[PDB]
Amino acid sequence: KFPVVDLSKLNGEERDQTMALINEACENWGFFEIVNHGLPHDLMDKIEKMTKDHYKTCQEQKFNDMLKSKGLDNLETEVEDVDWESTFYVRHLPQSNLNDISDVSDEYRTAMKDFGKRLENLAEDLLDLLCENLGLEKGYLKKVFHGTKGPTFGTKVSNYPPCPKPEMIKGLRAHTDAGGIILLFQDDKVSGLQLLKDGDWIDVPPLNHSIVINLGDQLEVITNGKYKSVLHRVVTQQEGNRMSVASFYNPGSDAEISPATSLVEKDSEYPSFVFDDYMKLYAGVKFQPKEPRFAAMK
């Protein structure tokens, strides 16, 4: 059963049990859903509606332009080198480009700014729960992530349109995320996101007004492997356009990333590096195995 965490149970004497659920999702799933997370359901509903309307208005034509430009009109053999995906990226931190994206509406930009700020505070709240579960001092992960200019925080807004031949192409090929903590607002009707657990692909179930959390490669390093970043993918379907609004809380470019000493006894197998060196490498090898990227930092 996929972990669903009720964050409102942290405000009372059920808080220890909630923390234990968070910790075991972090150790064994790499993913969990959160409900009662404090984000207004009214804000999620308009983010959802304006994301979908901005797709028809602005992204659908770019998407078909892409399928023509790569011959994906007609899928007669398996395509393992492209994602059946429509995306644009919004940067929040350290410097916002929200007011420079030309094709987004005023009210969409205002909703995205509010949504991004609330998710940034929720990311930092979640990192503190991780710290507590890890036996780290409060604020430890936030301070590691800061670097010189503060954390990097952006939002990937994706749609995975219907695919006539889902067997032939993935919406997004299997990978682990490079960063710190990932907070996903996904479609509540159209499924597609899957994680790999114990040798099976497991669906990340659509759930109304929920946020999906998962941990990236940097948290595997800092926890000395105690919390691993898990492989995940998006599969297409013939009917349905799955919406994806995923926010990435990453260390600053010059943050020093290393295994926390209190989590290391035997010499660590994980490297110590500067985050931007990891991200330069990751961009070119995102869909290749994760383990060579750690070795490359030594």
Q: What is the DSSP code (8-state) at residue 98? A: G
Phi, psi at residue 291, to the nearest 5°? -60, -40
78 binds a second copy (CB under 8 A): yes
Contact in structure between 187 and 206 (CB atoms under 8 Å): yes
214 binds ligand 6PC (CB under 6 A): yes
Residues 220-249 that bind Zn ion (CB under 5 A): none
* CA distance readout (Å), 52 to 98, 146, 185, 222, 284: 18, 33, 13, 37, 30
Q: Which does 246 bind (CB under 5 to 8 A by kind): Zn ion, ligand 6PC, a second copy, none?
A: ligand 6PC
177 binds Zn ion (CB under 5 A): yes
Please state, in angstroms and rounded to a whole number, the distance separating the CA atoms of residues 149 and 127.
Answer: 19
Dihedral through CA 72, CA 205, CA 178, CA 167, nearest 10? -20
Total residues contacting a second copy (rule CB under 8 A)? 47
Q: Are strands 200-203 and 193-197 parallel, antiparallel or unpaired?
A: antiparallel
Q: What is the DSSP code (8-state) at residue 9? A: G
Q: Which residue has the tokens 């209190």?
A: 262
| H or E element in which residue 64 lies | helix 60-69
Nearer to a second copy, 92 or 170 (CB): 170
Q: Give the contact letters, 254-273, x = binds to a second copy (CB under 8 A), - = no.
A: -----------xxx-xxx--
Pair of tokens at residue 81: 């080198």
CB of 251 to ligand 6PC, least distance (A): 17
Any binding-site annotation on 232?
yes
Total residues contacting ligand 6PC (rule CB under 6 A)? 9
Single out the residue of 48, 60, 188, 276 in contact with a second copy (rule: CB under 8 A): 60
Work out the angle between the directed axes of helices 15-28 and 106-134 (0-180°, nearest 10): 90
156 binds ligand 6PC (CB under 6 A): yes
Pair of tokens at residue 101: 């994206």
Work out the angle between the directed axes of helices 106-134 and 41-54 (0-180°, nearest 10): 120
Stretch that binds a second copy, among 1-9, 63-71, 86-94, 152-160 (CB under 8 A): 63-71
* CA distance readout (Å), 262 to 113, 266, 267: 37, 11, 12
Q: Which does 289 bind (CB under 5 to 8 A by kind): a second copy, Zn ion, ligand 6PC, none?
A: a second copy
Nearer to Zn ion, 85 or 257 (CB): 85
Any binding-site annotation on 175?
yes
CB of 198 to ligand 6PC, least distance (A): 19
Q: Give the contact letters, 193-232, x = binds to a second copy (CB under 8 A), - = no.
A: ---x-xxxx-----------------------------x-
Q: What is the DSSP code (8-state) at residue 165? A: -
Please state, in angstroms and rounded to a whole number, the distance separating the CA atoms of residues 38 and 8.
Answer: 8
CB of 5 to ligand 6PC, least distance (A): 16
Pair of tokens at residue 139: 């604020």
CB of 126 to a second copy, least distance (A): 18
Binding site residues, ligand 6PC, CB under 6 A: 156, 172, 177, 182, 184, 214, 232, 244, 246
Residues at the interface with a second copy (CB under 8 A): 56, 60-61, 64-66, 68-71, 74, 76-78, 80, 100, 102, 139, 143, 165, 173-174, 196, 198-201, 231, 233, 238, 265-267, 269-271, 284-285, 287-292, 294-295, 298
